[PDB]
Design a protein around this ligand. Structure first.
Ligand SMILES: *[C@@H]1O[C@H](CO)[C@@H](O[C@@H]2O[C@H](CO)[C@@H](O[C@@H]3O[C@H](CO[C@H]4O[C@H](CO[C@H]5O[C@H](CO)[C@@H](O)[C@H](O)[C@@H]5O)[C@@H](O)[C@H](O)[C@@H]4O)[C@@H](O)[C@H](O[C@H]4O[C@H](CO)[C@@H](O)[C@H](O)[C@@H]4O)[C@@H]3O)[C@H](O)[C@H]2NC(C)=O)[C@H](O)[C@H]1NC(C)=O
Ligand SMILES: *[C@@H]1O[C@H](CO)[C@@H](O[C@@H]2O[C@H](CO)[C@@H](O[C@@H]3O[C@H](CO)[C@@H](O)[C@H](O)[C@@H]3O)[C@H](O)[C@H]2NC(C)=O)[C@H](O)[C@H]1NC(C)=O
Ligand SMILES: *[C@@H]1O[C@H](CO[C@@H]2O[C@@H](C)[C@@H](O)[C@@H](O)[C@@H]2O)[C@@H](O[C@@H]2O[C@H](CO)[C@@H](O)[C@H](O)[C@H]2NC(C)=O)[C@H](O)[C@H]1NC(C)=O
Ligand SMILES: *[C@@H]1O[C@H](CO[C@@H]2O[C@@H](C)[C@@H](O)[C@@H](O)[C@@H]2O)[C@@H](O[C@@H]2O[C@H](CO)[C@@H](O)[C@H](O)[C@H]2NC(C)=O)[C@H](O)[C@H]1NC(C)=O
Ligand SMILES: *[C@@H]1O[C@H](CO)[C@@H](O[C@@H]2O[C@H](CO)[C@@H](O)[C@H](O)[C@H]2NC(C)=O)[C@H](O)[C@H]1NC(C)=O
Ligand code: NAG
Ligand code: NAG
Lengths: 294, 156
C-alpha cells in the first residue's frame, strides 16, 4: 500500500522510527533477499533478524526502532538480480525545539489562496495512538486526534512551522514521527496576459543602404520572454542584429519590456519581408509583424 | 523552427508536492522530499528548463534537462519518456520536436503548469503511480481538470 523509498539519499532525525522500503514488492513473493550496511569505509556487513535489537528485517522493508546516529551509512538491498542502494544520513535531534530545523519541507503559499495541512502517516497508522499538530511548537486545537487538518484561505499570520507529531507504541516503548512544514505566506503574484504594445502590422519606410531600428515593446510578467524572428534557420542576414532587452517595472510590479531589431545596410532582401516580434509566457503568446518598404 | 534563448534551474513537483528526480537507473520519478533531501539528492532533483523561440508561437517552448556525470535532455520519442544523453540544442529546424514541450499554466491557476508535447498534440507530461513508484510519463489529456498533468516549477 505504501510507496517504495526510491530516492538515493535519505535524511532522518535520531530517535524516530524509520524504514526504507525497496522497489520490488510484487517481486518479493517468488529467503533470496538480503540487506547490507556499509559504515565509513567498512566495505559492507550483512544485516540479520537480530543484528541489532532496533533493526527489524522484512521482505520489502528494513525497519529501525528507532533510528539512531550510529545508523548513518550506506545501505544495499539484493534480491536475486535486483539491487538497490540508499545513503542514510541520521541527523542529531534538536532537543530544545519540538522539531529539528534541518528536517523541514518548505511551502510558499500566496495570500488569500487555499491553504491546507493534513497529518497522515500511511505506514505506521496501525501503531499510531494519537497524532497532534503544532504551529511553532504550540499545540493547535483541531478536533481530530487521528488526522488533524487545517483548511483555510491563507493569511500572512498563517506563516510558520507546522509540525505533525504521530505518537505510537512498539513493544511498550512510546515513539513519535515528527514532520514539519515551513509555510511562507507571500503577496499575490497576480500574473497578467502579456500584451504587445502598438499595431499588429507595421509598415516602416526605409531607404536602401541605410540602417533601421525596429522597436518592439510589451507589457509582460517577470518570467516572460520577448524575441524577434528574422530568419535565423540556416544563418540570418549578417546585417540583422537583435539588441539587448530593456525592462522598466510598472507601479503594479509588472514589466515594460523593449527589444530592438537593428537592420543595418538595408537591401532588397529586407524589403517585403515580415520581421516578427513575439512575447511568450506560460499565460499565452502574442506576435506583431514589421514590413520594410521603400 | 526553434532557437535556444535562455536556461534556468528549477525544481519540478507534482500537485502532491513530490519532487521529480532522475534515479540511479536514469528513470524520471516522483518522491516526497524534505528541503534537505531535495538538496542532498541534487543534481538529480535540479532540472535545467531552457526557453526557445518558436517560428509559430503556441505557448512557452521549453526543454527539460538534467546535469549529472553527463547532461541529459527529456525526450518523449515514440510516446515513451526517456532522458537522452545530449545538451539542449542551439537550433531545431522543425515545428515539432520530441524534446520541445509547451509550458502552459492552467486557466485560473497561474502556478499549476502543464507541458504539452510539440510532436504529439494533446499529449502531456504526467505523474502516474506504477506499482510502488511514481513515474514521469506521457499521457493523452482525457478528462478536463486532470491533476496528474499539472506541476509546479520552483526557481532559484
Ligand atoms: C518525539 O520523541 C523524541 C524522542 O524520541 C522526544 O525527544 C525529547 O524531547 C525533549 C524536549 O522536547 C528533550 O528534553 C529536553 O532536554 C534538554 C537537554 O537535555 C540534556 O540533559 C539531559 C539530562 O538528563 C536528564 O534525563 C535523564 C534521563 O535520560 C534524567 O535521569 C535526568 O534527571 C535529566 O532529567 C540529558 O539526558 C540529555 O541527553 C541532554 O544532554 C533540556 O534542556 C530540556 O529542558 C526543558 O525542561 C526543563 C525541565 O525539565 C525546563 O526547565 C527547560 O526550560 C526546558 O523546557 C528538555 O528536558 C529530550 O531529551 C528528548 N529526548 C530524546 C531521546 O531526544 C520528543 O520530545 C518527542 N516529541 C514530542 C512532541 O513528544
Ligand atoms: C525606434 O526608436 C528610436 C528611438 O529609440 C528611433 O530613433 C530615433 O530616430 C530619429 C530619426 O528617425 C532620430 O532623431 C533625429 O535624427 C538625427 C539623425 O542624424 C539624430 O542625430 C537626432 O537625434 C535627430 O533628432 C533619433 O536620434 C533616433 N534615436 C535613436 C536612439 O536612435 C527610431 O526611429 C524608431 N524606429 C522606428 C522604426 O520608428
Ligand atoms: C493509547 O494507548 C493506551 C494504552 O497504551 C498502553 O501503555 C503504553 C505506555 C504502552 O505500554 C502500550 O503498549 C500500552 O498498550 C490506550 O489506553 C487503554 O485504552 C482503553 C480503552 O480503549 C482503556 O479502557 C484502558 O484503561 C487503557 N489501558 C492502558 C493500559 O492505558 C489508549 O486508549 C490509546 N489511545 C488512543 C487514542 O488510541
Ligand atoms: C513572420 O510571421 C509571418 C506570419 O505568420 C503567421 O503568424 C505567426 C505568429 C505564426 O503563427 C505563423 O504560423 C503564421 O503563419 C510568417 O509567414 C508565414 O509563414 C508560414 C511558414 O513559413 C506560412 O505557412 C504562412 O503562409 C506565412 N504567412 C504569411 C502571411 O506570409 C513569417 O514566415 C514570419 N517571419 C519570419 C522571419 O519567421
Ligand atoms: C523557511 O522558508 C523560507 C522561505 O523559503 C526560508 O527563508 C529563506 O532563507 C534563505 C537563507 O536560508 C534566504 O536567502 C531567503 O531570502 C529566505 N526567503 C525568505 C522569503 O525569507 C527559511 O530559511 C526556511 N526555514 C528553514 C528552517 O528552512
Ligand atoms: C547505537 O547508539 C545507541 C545510542 O544512540 C546505543 O544505545 C546502541 O547500543 C548503539 N548500537 C551500536 C551497534 O553501536
Ligand atoms: C533481472 O533478470 C531479468 C531476467 O531474468 C531481467 O529481465 C531484468 O531486467 C533483471 N533486472 C535488473 C534490475 O537487471
Amino acid at each position: 500500500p505504501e510507496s517504495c523509498t526510491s530516492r538515493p539519499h535519505i535524511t532522518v532525525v535520531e530517535g524516530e522510527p524509520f524504514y526504507l522500503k525497496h522497489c520490488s514488492c510484487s517481486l518479493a513473493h517468488e529467503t533470496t533477499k538480503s540487506w547490507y550496511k556499509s559504515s565509513g569505509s567498512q566495505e559492507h556487513v550483512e544485516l540479520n533478524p537480530r543484528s541489532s535489537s532496533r533493526i527489524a528485517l522484512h521482505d520489502c522493508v528494513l525497519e529501525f526502532w528507532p533510528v539512531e546516529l550510529n545508523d548513518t551509512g550506506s545501505y544495499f538491498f539484493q534480491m536475486k538480480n535486483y539491487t538497490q542502494k540508499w545513503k542514510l544520513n541520521v541527523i542529531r535531534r534538536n532537543k530544545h525545539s519540538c522539531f529539528t530545523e534541518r528536517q523541514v519541507t518548505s511551502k510558499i503559499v500566496e495570500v488569500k489562496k487555499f491553504f491546507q495541512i493534513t497529518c497522515e502517516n500511511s505506514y505506521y497508522q496501525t501503531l499510531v495512538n494519537s497524532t497532534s499538530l503544532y504551529k511553532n511548537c504550540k499545540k493547535l486545537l483541531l478536533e481530530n486526534n487521528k488526522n488533524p487538518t487545517i483548511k483555510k484561505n491563507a493569511e500572512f499570520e498563517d506563516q510558520g512551522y507546522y509540525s505533525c507529531v504521530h505518537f505510537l507504541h512498539h513493544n511498550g516503548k512510546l515513539f513519535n514521527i515528527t514532520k514539519t512544514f515551513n509555510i511562507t505566506i507571500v503577496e499575490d503574484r497576480s500574473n497578467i496576459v502579456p500584451v504587445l504594445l502598438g499595431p499588429k502590422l507595421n509598415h516602416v519606410a526605409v531607404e536602401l543602404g541605410k540602417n533601421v531600428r525596429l522597436n518592439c515593446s510589451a507589457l509582460l510578467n517577470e518570467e516572460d520572454v520577448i524575441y524577434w524572428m528574422f530568419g535565423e534557420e540556416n544563418g540570418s542576414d549578417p546585417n540583422i542584429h537583435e539588441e539587448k532587452e530593456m525592462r522598466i517595472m510598472t507601479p503594479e510590479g509588472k514589466w515594460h519590456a523593449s527589444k530592438v531589431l537593428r537592420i543595418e545596410n538595408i537591401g532588397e532582401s529586407n524589403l517585403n519581408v515580415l520581421y516578427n516580434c513575439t512575447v511568450a509566457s506560460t499565460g499565452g503568446t502574442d506576435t506583431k509583424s514589421f514590413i520594410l518598404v521603400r | 523552427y526553434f532557437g535556444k534563448l535562455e536556461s534556468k534551474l528549477s525544481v519540478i513537483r507534482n500537485l502532491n508536492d513530490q519532487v521529480l528526480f532522475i534515479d540511479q537507473g536514469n528513470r524520471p520519478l516522483f518522491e516526497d522530499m524534505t528541503d534537505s533531501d531535495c538538496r542532498d539528492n541534487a543534481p538529480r532533483t535540479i532540472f535545467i528548463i531552457s526557453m526557445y523561440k518558436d517560428s509559430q508561437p503556441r505557448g512557452m517552448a521549453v526543454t527539460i534537462s538534467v546535469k549529472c556525470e553527463k547532461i541529459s535532455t527529456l525526450s518523449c520519442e515514440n510516446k515513451i519518456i526517456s532522458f537522452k544523453e545530449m545538451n539542449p540544442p542551439d537550433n531545431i529546424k522543425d515545428t515539432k520536436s520530441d524534446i520541445i514541450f509547451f509550458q502552459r499554466s492552467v486557466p485560473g491557476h497561474d502556478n499549476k503548469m502543464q507541458f504539452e508535447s510539440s510532436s504529439y498534440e494533446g499529449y502531456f507530461l504526467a505523474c502516474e503511480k506504477e506499482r510502488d513508484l511514481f513515474k514521469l510519463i506521457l499521457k493523452k489529456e482525457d478528462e478536463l481538470g486532470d491533476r496528474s498533468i499539472m506541476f509546479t516549477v520552483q526557481n532559484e
